[PDB]
């Protein structure tokens, strides 16, 4: 359970993944639901995955070791149906996991390298989706990427553009 | 073969393990309850003295509603996402106030059974025993209905007013168990012994079934937005809290109770 | 200075003139009921006889009620677009609760004092007539609070739904109309006579306002959608109702109570 | 009170009128609020008017004698707040005025012309203003527009994009 294992591995037969496509400069879609982008569900404990409309918000420009606050409005959707899950973009590899509530703000999964430092909720009378971005890191410089997953094979069909968040030194 | 995950062999239980912790402990409660329930049933056959025959139907309901108790902490794990958001509103406060209007009960009739009075009639310790339960039930099937119909419903309101409102809805039973310990606390003044540890049984329950509140009603009230322990410990704590106080009522409460009116 | 007109010198009321023809009736409601209190409140000086006197708390809230159903009918025409929507669902089955758990009260003080027994002190005819308001206080404090911040407020309800839940909401006053009415039948086996014209009085005037009540809910649920008269006679029904049960209340029982309670 | 009675008037001193500015093959907008298109309040008794985005539905092609239903659906406005117009658009003189629904669907003031065919009603749930046509005329072809007056003045600042019915022999 290190960086990124897999789209081999030899733990195939203990669960079940998908496959991702991506256009460059978008959203990625997924291809196919259900021992040899990409996804793998995995029973790590720490949350493991690795690889109508949703927008995010947020533009400020604040100093490393400052704080800032990430969201993702959406409607034409029932909001207390799935799960969403912030997910974060890097040049290179691609998509990597963030914090991933569901149900109704009952599951608050932290991501492994960020747990400590986002704080992550599901408000479901404004259907809207945040993110509390406080002590804020110079290299973590990405694109959070906001989606709502199927549930039974983690797929993301719903997603949305992101927000280019540059905090750097 | 119901767990406590996102959906459908997907990620598990998060924070801490309120699941099997909670689920075993109901399931124990249901099977202990059942035969306790079983046994408390045969107790009519042998039981001859009419002067304590009065409370049976009281300790009955006692029972049927510990056991609706047990029976809601199975379905207050699986979140307000569900078509049990209803019940969890509702089933809450009607089967507290059961209970706590059968300790009103059991408490008039030691009142009125310690200072040389007669104990009431079958007919008035159950009606003493639903009549105070009848205004939970007015309040509960009517905030029920008044938002899974009228307003917006439970699955899209925020936390920080869907666990607010629970306070709102059990000021009531809070009422009712006040009413019970104080009227247990006047006990004190009796001659007659014989009752006198029912009462001070009584004392005891609602002294524990106080101090359980005291904290719990105010942790989600005041603690977990600042120990950022919401909503994650909002439900645990909450069947945690029924889960006890089912645990208190059957132990602490129905035990004693039949050790002294026990078996011969 | 006050009109029913669309807004600051717009188009007047439509369909009928359901606008002064109720105000002036409230307005000389209020000046009789405030003489009338008066003049009661007076009462209290020259009456000596304390079986009577008894009784004059609970007439006193009937008055208090019907002077509210007189103020509430002035503020029941604007139709709910401001905030007078809260009141137009709590104010009325609080009064209407008050004006009927009196007659209640009377009605048990009847049948208390024509049998032979000794009628109920001011404490208990007081105690009475307010606790069988204390269930619909609490039922409308509940309505009211529920709508106006938990689900969505009453100025986004359809008519349809908008005065359906004045039916369910006026449940519980009809149940104290029926129990009240069955009471003043029941009260036909009694030797005593000084009484019994209160008995025949209350009867009268649950008649009428059961008579009052069998037709308007059920226009209102059921032909205003076949009469084409919704929501147009919608609220002005209601006010029409409203402020001839406080006229029948006024006149048929308090002139006549005053006057077999008359002054010397 | 026949057809069009300015815009000199000999009644001046007894209400308030309005101006109007209508661009063509678009919805008019106010111009100024509050004895010498135009609009003219008056005292008749029968409704005296003659001269954030709304949307109006309706698209079957009923027989004369038949039976229609239009509607106006509308949001990002307060519906309960003001009282709303449907009006209609002929050739040569321009709009005329049909039901006027207000508050909360208590005050059915129906054209004079239609008093008996139209049918209007406001809900504020999801809300939506429809019409019934029923009992349909050959001589009705119009586009009848959807607005929200100001009420003060009579002035109709929200306005819609009516529907091309044309209900013909």
Same mark, same amino acid.
């Given at each position: 359970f290190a960086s990124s294992e897999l789209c081999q591995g030899d733990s195939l037969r203990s669960y079940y993944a998908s496959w991702y496509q991506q256009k460059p400069g978008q959203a990625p879609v997924l291809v196919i639901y259900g021992n040899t982008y990409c996804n793998s569900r995995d029973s790590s404990?720490?949350?493991?995955?690795?690889?109508?409309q949703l927008v995010?918000?947020?533009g400020g420009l604040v100093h490393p070791g400052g704080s800032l606050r990430l969201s993702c409005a959406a409607s034409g959707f029932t909001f207390r149906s799935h799960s969403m899950n912030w997910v974060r973009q890097a040049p290179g590899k691609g998509l990597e996991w963030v914090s991933s509530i569901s149900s109704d703000s009952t599951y608050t *999964? *932290?991501?492994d390298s960020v747990k400590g430092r986002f704080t992550i909720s599901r408000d479901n009378a404004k259907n809207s989706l945040y993110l509390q971005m406080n002590s804020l890191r110079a290299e973590d410089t990405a694109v959070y990427y906001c989606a709502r997953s199927g549930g039974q094979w983690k797929y993301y069909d719903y997603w949305g553009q992101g927000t280019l968040v540059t905090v750097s030194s | 073969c119901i767990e406590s995950t996102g959906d459908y062999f997907l990620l598990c239980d998060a924070e801490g393990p309120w699941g099997i912790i909670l689920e075993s402990l109901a399931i124990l409660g249901i099977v202990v309850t059942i035969l306790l329930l079983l046994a408390f049933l045969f107790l009519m056959r042998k039981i001859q003295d009419c002067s304590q025959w009065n409370v049976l139907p009281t300790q @009955? @309901?006692? @029972?049927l509603s510990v056991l609706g108790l047990f029976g809601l902490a199975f379905a207050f794990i699986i979140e307000l996402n569900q078509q049990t958001a209803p019940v969890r509103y509702f089933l809450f406060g009607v089967l507290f106030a059961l209970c706590f209007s059968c300790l009103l009960a059991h408490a008039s009739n030691l009142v009125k059974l310690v200072r040389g009075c007669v104990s009431f009639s079958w007919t008035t310790i159950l009606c003493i025993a639903i009549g105070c339960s009848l205004l939970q039930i007015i309040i509960?099937? =009517?905030?029920?209905?008044?938002?899974?119909?009228r307003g917006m419903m439970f699955v899209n309101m925020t936390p920080c007013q @869907?666990?607010?409102?629970?306070?709102?809805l059990l000021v009531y039973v809070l009422f009712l168990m006040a009413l019970t310990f104080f009227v247990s606390k006047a006990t004190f003044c009796g001659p007659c012994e014989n009752w006198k540890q029912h009462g001070r049984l009584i004392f005891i329950t609602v002294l524990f079934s106080i101090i359980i509140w005291?904290?719990? %009603?105010?942790?989600?009230?005041?603690?977990?937005?600042?120990?950022?322990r919401q909503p994650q410990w909002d439900d645990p704590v909450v069947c945690i809290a029924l889960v006890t106080n089912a645990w208190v009522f059957l132990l602490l409460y129905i035990v004693? =109770?039949?050790? %002294?009116?026990?078996?011969?």
């Amino acid at each position: 359970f290190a960086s990124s294992e897999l789209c081999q591995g030899d733990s195939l037969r203990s669960y079940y993944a998908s496959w991702y496509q991506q256009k460059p400069g978008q959203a990625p879609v997924l291809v196919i639901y259900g021992n040899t982008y990409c996804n793998s569900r995995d029973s790590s404990g720490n949350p493991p995955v690795v690889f109508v409309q949703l927008v995010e918000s947020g533009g400020g420009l604040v100093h490393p070791g400052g704080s800032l606050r990430l969201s993702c409005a959406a409607s034409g959707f029932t909001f207390r149906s799935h799960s969403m899950n912030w997910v974060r973009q890097a040049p290179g590899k691609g998509l990597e996991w963030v914090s991933s509530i569901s149900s109704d703000s009952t599951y608050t *999964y *932290y991501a492994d390298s960020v747990k400590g430092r986002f704080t992550i909720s599901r408000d479901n009378a404004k259907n809207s989706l945040y993110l509390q971005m406080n002590s804020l890191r110079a290299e973590d410089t990405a694109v959070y990427y906001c989606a709502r997953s199927g549930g039974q094979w983690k797929y993301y069909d719903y997603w949305g553009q992101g927000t280019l968040v540059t905090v750097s030194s | 073969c119901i767990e406590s995950t996102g959906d459908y062999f997907l990620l598990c239980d998060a924070e801490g393990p309120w699941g099997i912790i909670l689920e075993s402990l109901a399931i124990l409660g249901i099977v202990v309850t059942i035969l306790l329930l079983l046994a408390f049933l045969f107790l009519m056959r042998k039981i001859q003295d009419c002067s304590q025959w009065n409370v049976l139907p009281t300790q @009955l @309901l006692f @029972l049927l509603s510990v056991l609706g108790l047990f029976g809601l902490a199975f379905a207050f794990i699986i979140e307000l996402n569900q078509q049990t958001a209803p019940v969890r509103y509702f089933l809450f406060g009607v089967l507290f106030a059961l209970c706590f209007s059968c300790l009103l009960a059991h408490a008039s009739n030691l009142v009125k059974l310690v200072r040389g009075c007669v104990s009431f009639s079958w007919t008035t310790i159950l009606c003493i025993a639903i009549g105070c339960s009848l205004l939970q039930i007015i309040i509960a099937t =009517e905030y029920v209905t008044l938002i899974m119909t009228r307003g917006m419903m439970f699955v899209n309101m925020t936390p920080c007013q @869907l666990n607010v409102d629970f306070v709102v809805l059990l000021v009531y039973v809070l009422f009712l168990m006040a009413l019970t310990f104080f009227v247990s606390k006047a006990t004190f003044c009796g001659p007659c012994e014989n009752w006198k540890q029912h009462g001070r049984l009584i004392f005891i329950t609602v002294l524990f079934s106080i101090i359980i509140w005291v904290v719990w %009603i105010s942790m989600l009230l005041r603690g977990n937005p600042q120990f950022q322990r919401q909503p994650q410990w909002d439900d645990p704590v909450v069947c945690i809290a029924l889960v006890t106080n089912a645990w208190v009522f059957l132990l602490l409460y129905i035990v004693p =109770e039949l050790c %002294i009116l026990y078996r011969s």
